Design a protein around this ligand. Structure first.
Ligand SMILES: CC(C)[C@@H]1CNC(=O)c2cc(-c3ccnc(NC(=O)C4CC4)c3)nn21
Ligand code: NA
Ligand code: NA
Ligand code: NA
Length: 545
């Protein structure tokens, strides 16, 4: 029905990011050719955005069109679960489309889906109970029935990994005392989700009932570890005495039940089943907050070191590591493995939680003990035939992880980057830790948008090396890949705006735009490549000037 000119304009509208507000003219255009648009699954979110849900005649027709639309993709369904959708039929449609995801993808979204329960009908949850262009770089830069609660519990009953995270994510929401004080009905809702969850597990078959007892075992274990950390952190004396107390309490299994337990899924990574904590290798970090390093004995004879923080809110780190995990999985789906280190983070309360400990050396220590990253690589991965006398595999891994983290920390606006938050493995993996400053916040004024340093660049042989050329190519390639998933990434951030995460809570209404602006969606792919190269070029020039 539309001509080539309106079809061109409709294509622009359907192309918009999920964040873009349609003008009155665009809404009218979308609504007029709604029947024409039923063929385009990507047009459905735009159409639903044109509906005045508070006008009954309009809602009725929008729901008829909803039933006739080419079904929308999983990633678009996340937009229908935000606070901007109340219509029960729309929200059920979202779950029906979300349900086509496999559990691997669902797990990538689950932190946000647990936030989205805030936007569901709280009575239904309760009732279920039983109560620009650089010419010289053109040629060198070629282009490459159920509601949400019922649904999540249903999938969790069938998948112990999903059940693990659903349990702990909900526990943390229940313990959020800001939510308790300021939004008591939301606190009640999360309690009811947990009661619904427990009730469903108790009704299941033999292994589903065992899942309930394993979550209880984990909760009890974590409670004991918290009791231990309180005892250690209040112990009289100095650090020697505190470490001795830490190890003595861990060694007293009859008292504390932390060093010799029947196999329990590790909350941090429930695929890993643990036999207890090794008493003799546990110590406190020197940090004044006294987190502990703890080595878990695993089912298969391994050791899994963690950081257990007590007295500290891990939720911002948890979100950032969950998003880095997602970005890594999206890049890998595009067959780009940049050797990233999305270490696990799991809050077990609003004031304690786990991080996966990655063996590595802080770059500041690399420099102080070996003088440079290349000297470090030459010491631990020598290769006579390799670049600068370093193993080609290690250098490749370094260039790739450098590019991946440059692009990812740029998108996430990570600040407070110093050489003790940058870690390096002897296999060449560079990675970032400690995400207390995100979305453009920095402890110093005028943080640069791009977080590079001379040491990284010298590590890849300087700006004229082959490795540096490959670094730049990996940067703009990862950038183009992540732009292609900007709808999904932005939809997930939109679900976090009411989370009590410090750097989001500061300006919830501006949070998603802080991320969107970094993708430069106003730029074509070709323009975006030159933008990213100007970013790197300007950053590196400043380092050496
Ligand atoms: C005092 C800490 C809690 C420190 C500060 N805040 C953090 O959030 C954090 C994350 C990590 C971390 C995560 C994964 N792996 C490592 N690995 C290493 O530290 C090896 C170099 C020795 C560190 N550390 N921190
Ligand atoms: Na299903
Ligand atoms: Na230990
Ligand atoms: Na895609």
């Amino acid at each position: 029905k539309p001509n080539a000119a309106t079809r061109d304009q409709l294509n622009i509208i359907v192309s918009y990011p999920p964040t873009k507000q349609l003008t009155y003219e665009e809404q009218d255009l979308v609504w007029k050719f709604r029947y024409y648009l039923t063929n385009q699954e990507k047009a459905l979110t735009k159409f639903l955005k044109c509906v005045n849900w508070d006008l009954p005649q309009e809602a009725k027709q929008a729901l008829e069109l909803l039933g006739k639309w080419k079904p929308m993709d999983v990633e678009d369904s996340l937009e229908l679960l935000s606070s901007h959708y109340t219509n029960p039929t729309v929200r059920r449609y979202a779950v029906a489309r979300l349900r086509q995801a496999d559990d691997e993808d669902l797990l990538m979204y689950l932190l946000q889906l647990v936030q989205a329960l805030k936007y569901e009908n709280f009575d239904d949850i309760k009732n279920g109970l039983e109560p620009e262009i650089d010419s010289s770089q053109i040629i060198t830069s070629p282009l490459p029935e159920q509601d949400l609660c019922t649904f999540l519990i249903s999938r969790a009953c069938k998948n112990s990994t999903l059940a693990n995270y659903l349990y702990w994510y909900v526990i943390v929401e229940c313990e959020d005392q800001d939510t308790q004080q300021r939004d008591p009905k939301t606190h009640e809702m999360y309690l009811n989700v947990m009661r619904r969850f427990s009730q469903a597990l108790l009704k299941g078959d033999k292994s589903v009932r065992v899942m309930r007892s394993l979550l209880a075992a984990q909760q009890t274990f974590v409670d004991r570890l918290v009791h231990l950390m309180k005892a250690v952190q209040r112990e009289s004396g100095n650090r020697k005495k505190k470490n001795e107390r830490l190890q003595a309490l861990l060694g007293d299994n009859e008292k504390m039940n932390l060093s010799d337990v029947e196999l329990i899924p590790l909350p941090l990574e429930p695929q890993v089943k643990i036999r207890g904590i090794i008493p003799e290798t546990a110590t406190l970090f020197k940090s004044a907050l006294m987190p502990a390093q703890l080595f878990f004995k695993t089912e298969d004879g391994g050791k899994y070191p963690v950081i257990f923080k007590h007295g500290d809110d891990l939720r911002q780190d948890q979100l950032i590591l969950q998003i880095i995990s997602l970005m890594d999985k999206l890049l890998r789906k595009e067959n780009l493995d940049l050797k990233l280190t999305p270490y696990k983070v799991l809050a077990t309360s609003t004031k304690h939680g786990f991080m996966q400990f990655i063996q590595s050396v802080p770059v500041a220590e690399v420099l102080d003990t070996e003088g440079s990253i290349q000297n470090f690589f030459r010491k631990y991965a020598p290769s006579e035939n390799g670049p600068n006398g370093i193993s080609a595999e290690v250098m490749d891994t370094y260039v790739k992880s450098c590019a991946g983290y440059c692009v990812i920390t740029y998108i996430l606006g990570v600040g407070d980057r110093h050489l003790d938050n940058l870690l390096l493995t002897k296999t060449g993996k560079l990675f970032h830790i400690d995400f207390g400053y995100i979305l453009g916040r920095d402890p110093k004024p005028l943080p640069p948008p791009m977080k590079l340093n001379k040491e990284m660049v010298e590590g890849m042989g300087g700006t004229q090396s082959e490795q540096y050329q490959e670094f730049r190519k990996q940067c703009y390639t990862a950038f183009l890949h992540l732009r292609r998933y900007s709808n999904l990434i932005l939809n997930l951030f939109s679900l976090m705006v009411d989370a009590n995460i410090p750097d989001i809570a500061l300006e919830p209404d501006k949070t998603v735009k802080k991320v969107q602006d970094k993708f430069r969606l106003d730029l074509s792919d070709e323009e975006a490549v030159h933008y990213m190269q100007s970013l790197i070029d300007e950053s590196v020039h400043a380092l050496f000037a």
